[PDB]
Design a protein around this ligand. Structure first.
Ligand SMILES: [Mg+2]
Ligand SMILES: [Zn+2]
Lengths: 136, 141, 38, 94
RNA sequence: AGCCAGGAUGUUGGCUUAGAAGCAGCCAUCAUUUAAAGAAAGCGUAAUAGCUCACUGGUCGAGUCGGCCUGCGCGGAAGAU
């Protein structure tokens, strides 16, 4: 699973996930899996989708993961009362706003990339769409 | 003419007599038995060519006297003597193994005068040329 | 009968058909492919 | 050879622009050259269809405002974050 | 979309492979006759045998196809007096 090699701090405030995305254009490949929805992608989800794409294209073309899970998510364990410090870091998420290109791909035909992105999308908790590299 | 009653396309080296083992059970299953090619196939093998496989039709009958009309050995076999090479594929494009001319392929074509329904010399010429550029020996022109 | 929330044409002979408000897949070829949405 | 029919727009700002995009139009701007910039409104579907072609981003375009032709170039495009729509185009006078 | 014929030849192209001529699998993915036929997509065969399909001629005599953008709806949808 992806996670920062180091972080400045172990734990982050929950924060909010308002706003539209920044990395909105296909900037590295020919095709992209854009996020229509708003949510968080765990590192496990990103990895599951990546395995799905990579296996679908059969080690062909090339894949960019435009999102990195850099936010630690704490959980409290079972049977633990509500106070007494922040929970432990269990997993890492990328916050995803609408418009975020999540994955990019090239070196494949558009039909194959559409299939691969469909498999990956099925791995993911947010609604996605298939986008193409845009001239300007 | 008659409708295509029943037939099998499986044939082996001609010069060697009684070619039962290399075919075996395919032909002797529906209409035509074993010992009816140590003469008839040989009665037609001599006047054409010895020592190279020659495919033939077997259009069987209820009357047990099946009609056979043969074809000239295909380019599947012939383009071995003229090129001087036995090997075909394996490395046709990785590093060429066979060498033939256009004239010898044209020769292999002309010997096949009625071998198929063709009216143009150049058509059959490039047909054999395609056959050669397929199996893996570059025709030299 | 495959009762699924996701019913799909599983091959060329499958057909989606809506019967009595239920999406079904009927396959002339493969009876395994027949599906009901539910 | 792309010909785009545009209207100068009096309303500007975020409310007016969102109202435009709700009416299936979208704002654009023409700047560059020597004249003052010209804020226009464009029919969204026609321009979207046009800009589906790479020549739209390469060639000189013609924009007709008040029956008057302006030779421009599509120099910047704002798209919807996730919908296949256009938010805005900058046209530089060509 | 139906219905009527085809759906080929070189070819069995091959390399392989316990068995692959269209299919454990790896290439070339070319030519011929063509109105049209893939070096073959699903089956199917012990590989072959074989059912199709891709594609083209006739009958038919108006639309037809499937993508995106949207409204509303459909399934997904099981609990206890
Ligand atoms: Mg406001
Ligand atoms: Zn089916």
């Amino acid at each position: 699973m992806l996670q920062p090699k180091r972080t400045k701090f172990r734990k982050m405030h929950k924060g909010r996930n308002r706003g539209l995305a920044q990395g909105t254009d296909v900037s590295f490949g020919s095709f992209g899996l854009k996020a229509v929805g708003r949510g968080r992608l765990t590192a496990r989800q990103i990895e599951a989708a990546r395995r799905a794409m990579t296996r679908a294209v059969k080690r062909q073309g090339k894949i960019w993961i435009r999102v990195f899970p850099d936010k630690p998510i704490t959980e409290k364990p079972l049977a633990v009362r509500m106070g007494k410090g922040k929970g432990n870091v269990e997993y890492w998420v990328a916050l995803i706003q609408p418009g975020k290109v999540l994955y990019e791909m090239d070196g494949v035909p558009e039909e194959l990339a559409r299939e691969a992105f469909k498999l990956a999308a099925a791995k993911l908790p947010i609604k996605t769409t298939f986008v193409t590299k845009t001239v300007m | 003419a008659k409708k295509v009653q029943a037939y099998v396309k499986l044939q082996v080296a001609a010069g060697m007599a009684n070619p039962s083992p290399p075919v075996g059970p395919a032909l002797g299953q529906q209409g035509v038995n074993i010992m009816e090619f140590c003469k008839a196939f040989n009665a037609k093998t001599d006047s054409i060519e010895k020592g190279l496989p020659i495919p033939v039709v077997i259009t069987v009958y209820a009357d047990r006297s099946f009609t056979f009309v043969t074809k000239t050995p295909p380019a599947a076999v012939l383009l071995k003597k003229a090129a001087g090479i036995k090997s075909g594929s394996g490395k046709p494009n990785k590093d060429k193994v066979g060498k033939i001319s256009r004239a010898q392929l044209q020769e292999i074509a002309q010997t096949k005068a009625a071998d198929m329904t063709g009216a143009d010399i150049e058509a059959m010429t490039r047909s054999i040329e395609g056959t050669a550029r397929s199996m893996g020996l570059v025709v030299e022109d | 009968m495959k009762v699924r929330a996701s019913v799909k044409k599983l091959c060329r002979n499958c057909k989606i058909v809506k019967r009595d408000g239920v999406i079904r897949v009927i396959c002339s070829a493969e009876p395994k492919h027949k599906q009901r949405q539910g | 050879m792309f010909t785009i029919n545009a209207e100068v727009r009096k309303e500007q700002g975020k409310g007016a622009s969102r109202r435009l995009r709700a009416a299936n139009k979208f704002p654009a701007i023409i700047y560059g050259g020597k004249e003052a910039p010209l804020a226009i409104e464009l029919d969204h579907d026609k321009v979207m269809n046009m800009q589906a072609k790479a020549e739209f981003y390469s060639e000189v375009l013609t924009i007709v405002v008040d029956g008057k032709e302006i030779k421009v170039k599509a120099q910047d495009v704002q798209r919807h974050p996730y919908k296949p729509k256009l938010q805005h185009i900058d046209f530089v006078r060509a």
